[PDB]
């Protein structure tokens, strides 16, 4: 019988991770339109943008107007990505429902991406919590959890130390991110099992990129050891411009199709999501790495010759 | 400790499944060159071509000359795909080491692909065995095992009945093929577990296409219940021209990378295979769906800015 604990919670990040690396600018009102459409698909969380330097990520420099302009569904948490105190204050002014703080477990990647050390990142996070606790809610992301494109292997003890530091600040919602798609299923089971001894399945998000084709295999491996919250991008958009060779997030409609075929519950309308994904080539001017947008679902049968 | 039973046996099908649907003709001597290169990569089996109607599959109409021209490595079985007695006789004349007989579990797909019923296909197989048993060796493939692009759901009892019919002819090596990428991991575990009560892991091949992005997830699910032999195509080439919307086989180098990262043994040289896959765009005039050819393996690190 279906159990409350079975639900896989699909969280949408195409407006942020998807668009930050897209070659072409997406106009502000079309970003708003995309989020308004995603808001009809069943997601509990949508990462609607970032509050970062416009010199670093020019594609997301309209975050304030995007957050101002979208239709707020009462049962959706609209998340903004935050690197420091200045971004946190911007996000609160824009009434982001949740601030997603981000640093990398790799010192080299944190310097390349945030232009500061991990210690400096956490110094900012401490000030953010001191000023804004009780005025908003927080998520703590550890990027390059499963390896780094610069440093290679990443110490799992260091990942856990960073998670514990988030907890010490009272931030118990945690994302582990595979920024350049370096994770494998055995490694995922080991890391997720250990982090789930610190926090609960309601608190842990896994954020996989599909750079080496293991994205959905890693989702299922994490699910098998109890993880339930997963980030994905419509059409398989995404990648970080400062992680070399980064590529798309796992594709939302491919993830939802996997769940639907296996029997894992989601609250996402798959048919409607595929239709929305198929509008992306016209919006962006190129095709996207979505298998379901190309092929359709199993029940899309073909006429007999 | 490493066990004899742990090895995942990677079997290469790009010269047949990969090329049959490619838009452009690959010249005969370049087909031979490709197989000669694949023969250096560690495969125990390479499907070097087909002996089918040139009206049906014009891209593979040079099968006799390909089999004549390749360098035969003594420890590799060169397989030819066979639909009927005429093709079997051609394959024996070309000294194929193994004849891969194919029919579909879907009557509609078998008629579309082979222009005969399943009963007619097995009538041919019976004559093939009667004439050529003891002169060659056989594999029996059941296509559309996991669903059909025309009929939709496919009876698992019917799949098992077809496997049993192969066994009655003395053909105990069996391939279950997911022709248009309709399989999911739970279904795979159920079907593979049952077939492994009839034949051994040394006898069963799984042949997955990646049409809905579940190819490697289905491989790992099959491996978890004891399957060990898997077909894959270099660069993710492949698809059947008579199965509508068919798309690539699972990508060989993505499969081998998954094994290498998890710790599943293979006998494939991954570095050399990636280098070979990266020659495909120049050969075919377009890029291929290989994640590893695009991104490189984890240990390909990037310079610090
Ligand atoms: C963290 C970050 C802001 C540091 O950049 P920096 O230029 O070294 O930061 P400094 O504080 O030295 O620069 C200060 C300037 O940037 C502005 N700035 C600082 N933080 C900002 C923020 N969060 N949003 C917007 N502007 C910001 C300051 O107001 C100031 O503007 P000025 O030039 O007119 O004075 C930048 O590296 C960044 O935005 N990184 C995130 C990139 C990203 O999102 N990557 C992908 C997802 S992780
Ligand atoms: C099975 C198949 C040969 C039946 O085709 P068909 O045209 O209905 O077959 P017929 O026996 O009625 O046609 C006989 C003609 O084809 C030839 N032929 C029959 N089987 C052949 C074979 N295996 N190889 C080459 N020629 C063959 C006959 O010699 C004859 O040639 P002719 O026209 O000069 O007389 C054809 O459907 C086929 O090759 N299908 C396989 C397609 C495939 O490989 N799909 C993807 C992988 S499953
Ligand atoms: Zn990301
Ligand atoms: Zn195939």
């Amino acid at each position: 019988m279906t159990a409350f604990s079975d639900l896989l919670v699909v969280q949408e990040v195409s407006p942020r991770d998807g668009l930050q690396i897209e070659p072409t600018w997406v106009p502000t009102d079309k970003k708003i339109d995309l989020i308004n459409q995603l808001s009809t698909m069943g997601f509990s969380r949508i990462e609607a943008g970032s509050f970062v330097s416009p010199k670093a990520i020019p594609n997301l420099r309209d975050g304030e107007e995007v957050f101002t302009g979208i239709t707020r569904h009462k049962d959706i948490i609209y998340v903004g990505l935050i690197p420091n105190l200045k971004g946190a204050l911007r996000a609160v002014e824009a009434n982001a429902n949740e601030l997603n703080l981000v640093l990398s477990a790799s010192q080299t990647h944190n310097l390349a991406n945030m232009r500061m050390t991990k210690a400096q990142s956490f110094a900012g996070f401490t000030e953010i919590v001191e000023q804004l606790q009780g005025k908003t809610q927080f998520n703590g992301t550890v990027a390059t959890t499963f390896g780094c494109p610069f440093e290679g292997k990443i110490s799992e003890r260091e990942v856990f130390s960073l998670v514990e530091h988030y907890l010490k600040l009272g931030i118990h919602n945690i994302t582990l991110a595979d920024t350049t798609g370096m994770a494998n299923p055995v490694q995922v089971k080991r890391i997720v099992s250990h982090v789930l001894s610190l926090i609960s399945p309601e608190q842990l998000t896994l954020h996989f990129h599909n750079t080496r084709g293991l994205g959905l295999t890693n989702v299922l491996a994490a699910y098998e050891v109890g993880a339930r919250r997963f980030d994905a991008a419509l059409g398989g958009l995404g990648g970080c411009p400062f992680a070399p060779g980064a590529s798309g997030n796992i594709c939302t409609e491919d993830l939802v199709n996997m769940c639907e075929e296996i029997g894992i519950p989601t609250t996402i309308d798959l048919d409607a999501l595929i239709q929305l994904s198929r509008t992306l080539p016209a919006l962006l001017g190129h095709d996207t790495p979505s298998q379901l947008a190309k092929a359709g679902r199993n029940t899309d049968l073909h006429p007999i010759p």
Side-chain angles (χ1 to χ4, degrees), chain A residues 2-85 87-92 94-129 131-132 134 136-156 158-201 203-303 305:
Chain A
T2 309
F4 167 75
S5 60
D6 296 341
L7 171 76
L8 188 151
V9 180
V10 179
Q11 308 175 149
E12 176 61 38
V13 303
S14 64
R16 194 284 296 174
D17 213 335
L19 298 188
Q20 66 185 15
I21 198 173
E22 269 301 306
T24 55
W25 171 255
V26 176
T28 303
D29 56 0
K30 295 185 190 191
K31 289 194 184 80
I32 288 163
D33 281 352
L34 172 66
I35 295 160
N36 286 348
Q37 288 295 122
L38 291 164
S39 287
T40 70
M41 297 291 158
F43 304 108
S44 60
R45 273 179 167 81
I46 297 171
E47 198 164 70
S50 296
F51 296 88
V52 300
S53 169
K55 294 181 179 184
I57 307 284
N59 275 342
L60 297 182
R61 70 190 302 168
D62 56 353
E64 178 147 18
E65 181 59 22
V66 171
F67 274 80
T68 290
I70 54 170
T71 301
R72 303 297 186 104
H73 291 231
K74 286 188 184 51
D75 286 308
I76 300 179
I77 297 161
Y78 297 93
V79 181
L81 180 147
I82 303 304
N84 61 10
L85 175 58
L89 291 174
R90 290 172 58 204
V92 168
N95 192 33
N97 300 143
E98 183 167 277
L99 275 52
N100 179 23
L101 321 189
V102 178
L103 91 170
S104 303
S106 160
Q107 190 81 287
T108 301
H109 189 264
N110 210 65
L111 288 164
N113 198 37
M114 301 298 189
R115 293 165 49 91
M116 54 186 151
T117 62
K118 290 181 278 184
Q120 291 172 307
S121 280
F122 257 102
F125 296 167
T126 303
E127 187 78 25
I128 287 160
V129 167
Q131 297 193 13
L132 303 176
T136 190
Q137 61 194 54
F138 302 112
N139 190 83
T141 294
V142 186
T144 65
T145 283
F146 305 91
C148 171
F150 301 113
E151 296 188 358
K153 298 279 205 191
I154 289 294
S155 166
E156 291 173 15
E158 174 67 8
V159 170
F160 305 147
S161 176
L162 297 167
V163 170
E164 290 178 322
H165 199 343
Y166 273 131
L167 265 42
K168 292 192 222 96
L169 294 185
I171 299 168
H172 283 248
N173 282 16
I174 301 299
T175 296
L176 305 178
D178 183 16
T179 308
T180 61
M182 295 175 74
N184 71 76
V186 170
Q187 171 198 34
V188 165
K189 286 188 178 190
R190 173 173 65 255
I191 289 175
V192 169
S193 297
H194 181 81
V195 175
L196 289 176
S197 78
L198 302 170
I199 62 178
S200 82
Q203 292 165 320
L204 174 65
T205 298
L206 276 306
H207 176 113
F208 293 116
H209 288 257
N210 195 42
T211 313
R212 287 160 187 101
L214 297 180
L216 293 181
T217 307
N218 289 331
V219 169
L220 198 55
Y223 185 91
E224 290 172 349
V225 295
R228 297 291 185 267
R229 298 173 54 188
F230 296 87
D231 289 344
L234 184 74
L237 298 175
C240 172
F242 301 106
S247 73
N249 297 80
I250 56 165
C251 173
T252 308
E253 60 268 22
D254 296 358
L255 167 63
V256 176
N257 179 73
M258 178 174 77
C259 292
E260 188 140 331
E261 291 300 299
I262 287 172
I264 293 175
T266 81
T267 63
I268 312 306
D269 179 347
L270 176 58
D271 285 322
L273 191 71
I274 290 167
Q275 184 189 30
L276 179 64
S277 180
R278 289 170 163 169
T279 74
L280 288 174
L283 177 64
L284 305 174
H286 59 80
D287 292 316
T288 82
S290 169
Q291 296 295 272
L292 269 286
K294 293 161 159 57
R297 62 189 309 166
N298 279 23
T299 54
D300 284 356
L301 302 181
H302 302 256

